[PDB]
């Protein structure tokens, strides 16, 4: 790799890193808004059993 | 390059498959939502004070609620592609940038008569009393059957001397989790087998069995479920637990579908 | 029963405010510091025009 | 996901919370001035008809 | 459902900020070196004239 | 009845705070991205004047 002027890895590392941050972000925020640890399965798919069982 | 290009449409179709899992398990909450509100009307349904009236008066709560049960199975769609209705079948999101590298999800039917959300009944001939007690030598019950696995079961319960028809029930429910015992007002013991537990008919045997005469299975679900009699939403009740459970093995395998995806979409970026 | 049955519902089901707020701070300053990143990469390009011709 | 302007989910998420919260703070409210728990059938038609049979 | 739906909406229809605007900047780069590099390859036909003598 | 009524009227008169002041933000990040984009294109013209002559 030297010098390039067409594409741009570390700004693509940077996109992929943002976008996890804003997953993890809007996660947080449905989290806190609904006050439930688990509003989707894939949060956790056996406690979600467990939770509407009880 | 034709590879990086095909990551992005992979990516792509990745999100869309992520997308339709979500919008079914959102419709899938709610279906649970309402199965929890119709086991709770069926479970006060169920006591002995109410009369006819109340009676009658939960069932056109419940029926509205199946209803609505089948309004949301066969409405629900993504872009006007139909996902509760039993309509979609397995279909292969293709995550990957050269072909066969697809997967394949499935989404079951969510209406309230498909045969997954209830299961077998069974209702004693022989009624009970008050007075009626467990006698010695005919105190033993034993149910026969095999569960969705196909392993042969045999459960023995050796229900309690002096026991009514209710404590029987009791010890039933107790002493087992594959089937749900419970009585009407007659006195006869109903006996709920859900079609997520068992497979095929259940065979009784033993003195007690041979007391109570348990008839042949009738094939219950959500759609013909009624509690205008104590039996009926004695029998609601495991019809929608049946249900609920069902429903919450869907929501957990499109859960896992959709960690699976997410995990495929940060590998494909990577 | 049922009140420990809300309890239990609660160790699983019910969200940490604390942790998640946490959470949520941790994820909007990794987000900005992304995003610092990024339009500082962006200019790679620059550089290399800016070079010569 | 991918930083936009003009779907906030997140904003969604929360829209449909708070009317959710909204919603049971009028009914505890409408509760807590009636000083019954049953002012419509909406909230339990069969102990309507047998309280109102009481 | 139409929380979901919108949610899957953006993922065709809306803009990644983050990736036009890296794009765009890749496309501007791309652009004034090519102009200047036109501007320089203007210059052969004066190299041309200066052939006689 | 007069209630009732009052409470059908919100649904359709009344405006959703949340959703509105969503919606101007939405529009406001939207005119200062144009506005942004707009100044930036009209650098076109004197990147073509600086090409040459």
Same mark, same amino acid.
């Given at each position: 790799m030297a010098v390039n002027v067409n594409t741009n890895v570390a700004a693509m590392t940077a996109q992929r890193y943002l976008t996890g941050a804003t997953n993890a972000q809007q996660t947080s925020m449905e989290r806190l808004s609904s006050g439930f640890k688990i509003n989707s399965a894939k949060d956790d798919a056996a406690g979600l059993q467990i939770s509407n069982r009880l | 390059?034709?590879?990086?290009?095909?990551?992005?449409?992979?990516?792509?179709?990745?999100?869309?498959?992520?997308?339709?899992?979500?919008?079914?398990?959102?419709?899938?909450?709610?279906? &649970?939502?309402?199965?929890?509100?119709?086991?709770?009307?069926?479970?006060? !349904?169920?006591?002995?004070?109410?009369?006819? !009236?109340?009676?009658?008066?939960?069932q056109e709560e419940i029926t509205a609620l199946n209803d609505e049960l089948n309004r949301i199975a066969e409405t629900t769609s993504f872009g006007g592609n139909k996902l509760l209705n039993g309509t979609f079948s397995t279909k292969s999101f293709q995550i990957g940038a050269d072909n066969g590298e697809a997967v394949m999800l499935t989404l079951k039917d969510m209406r309230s008569d498909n045969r997954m959300m209830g299961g077998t009944s069974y209702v004693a001939a022989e009624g009970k009393d008050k007075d009626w007690k467990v006698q010695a030598g005919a105190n033993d019950i034993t149910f026969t059957l095999?569960?969705?696995? #196909?392993?042969?079961? &045999?459960? &023995?319960?050796?229900?309690?001397?002096?026991?009514?028809?209710?404590?029987?029930?009791?010890?039933?429910? #107790?002493?087992?989790?594959?089937?749900?015992?419970?009585?009407?007002?007659? #006195?006869?013991?109903?006996?709920?087998?859900?079609?997520?537990?068992?497979?095929?008919?259940?065979?009784?045997?033993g003195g007690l069995a041979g007391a109570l005469n348990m008839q042949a299975g009738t094939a219950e679900t959500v759609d013909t479920i009624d509690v205008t009699s104590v039996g009926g939403a004695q029998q609601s009740v495991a019809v929608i637990d049946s249900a609920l459970k069902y429903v919450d093995s869907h929501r957990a395998e499109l859960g896992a579908f959709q960690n699976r995806f997410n995990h495929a979409i940060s590998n494909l970026d990577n | 029963i049922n009140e420990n049955v809300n309890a239990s519902k609660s160790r699983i089901k019910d969200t940490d405010f604390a942790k998640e707020t946490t959470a949520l701070t941790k994820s909007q300053i990794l987000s900005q510091a992304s995003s610092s990143v990024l339009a500082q990469a962006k200019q790679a390009p620059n550089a290399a025009l800016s070079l010569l011709g």
């Open positions: - | 390059n034709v590879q990086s290009r095909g990551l992005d449409v992979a990516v792509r179709n990745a999100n869309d498959g992520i997308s339709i899992a979500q919008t079914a398990e959102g419709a899938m909450n709610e279906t &649970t939502n309402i199965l929890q509100r119709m086991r709770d009307l069926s479970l006060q !349904s169920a006591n002995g004070s109410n009369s006819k !009236s109340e009676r009658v008066a939960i095999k569960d969705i696995d #196909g392993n042969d079961q &045999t459960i &023995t319960v050796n229900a309690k001397e002096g026991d009514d028809i209710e404590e029987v029930a009791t010890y039933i429910n #107790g002493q087992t989790d594959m089937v749900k015992a419970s009585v009407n007002e007659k #006195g006869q013991l109903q006996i709920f087998a859900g079609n997520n537990k068992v497979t095929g008919d259940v065979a009784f045997s | -």
